[PDB]
Amino acid sequence: QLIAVDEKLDITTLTGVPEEHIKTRKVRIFVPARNNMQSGVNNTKKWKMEFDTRERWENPLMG
């Protein structure tokens, strides 16, 4: 009723993410810094995961 298999979990083949958005991205795990414009600390309680910044260009129409 139990396999009891010992191996690290890997769900990459099930999430549907394209291949070049898996092995090429570099995520960052961090606690966001406090905004020095304010003295409140409620935005520095949790952990955040974010991806690396890619190219952002200007639209030829309307810019």
Partner 1 sequence: LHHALIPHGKGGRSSVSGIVATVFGATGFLGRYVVNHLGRMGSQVIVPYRCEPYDTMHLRPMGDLGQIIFMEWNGKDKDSIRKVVEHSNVVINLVGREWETKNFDFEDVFVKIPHAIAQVSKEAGVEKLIHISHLNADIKSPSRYLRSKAVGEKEVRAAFPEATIIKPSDIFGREDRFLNYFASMRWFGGVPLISLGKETVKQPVYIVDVSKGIINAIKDPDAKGKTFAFVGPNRYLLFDLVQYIFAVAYRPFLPYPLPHFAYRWVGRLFEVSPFEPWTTRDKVERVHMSDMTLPHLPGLEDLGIQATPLELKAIEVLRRHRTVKPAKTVN
Partner 2 sequence: GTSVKPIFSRDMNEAKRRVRELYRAWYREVPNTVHLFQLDISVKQGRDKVREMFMKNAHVTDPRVVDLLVIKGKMELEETINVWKQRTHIMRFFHETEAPRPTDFLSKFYVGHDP
Partner 3 sequence: TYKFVNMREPSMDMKSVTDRAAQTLLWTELVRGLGMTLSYLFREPATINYPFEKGPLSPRFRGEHALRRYPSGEERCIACKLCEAVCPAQAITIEAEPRADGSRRTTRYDIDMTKCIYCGFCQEACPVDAIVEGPNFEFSTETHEELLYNKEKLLNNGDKWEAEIAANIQADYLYR
Q: Which of residues 31-60 bind partner 1 (CB under 8 A)?
A: 55, 57-60
User: In whole angstroms, what is the distance from residue 49 CA to residue 25 CA?
Assistant: 12
What is the 3-state secondary structure of 13-56? CCCCCCHHHCCCCCCEEECCCCCCCCCCCCCCCCCEEECCCCCC
Q: Which of residues 4-63 bind partner 3 (CB under 8 A)?
A: 61-63
CB of residue 42 vs partner 1: minimum separation in angstroms?
38
Q: Does 20 bind partner 1 (CB under 8 A)?
A: no
User: For binding to partner 2 (CB under 8 A), which residues are involved?
Assistant: 1-7, 10-11, 13-14, 24, 54-55
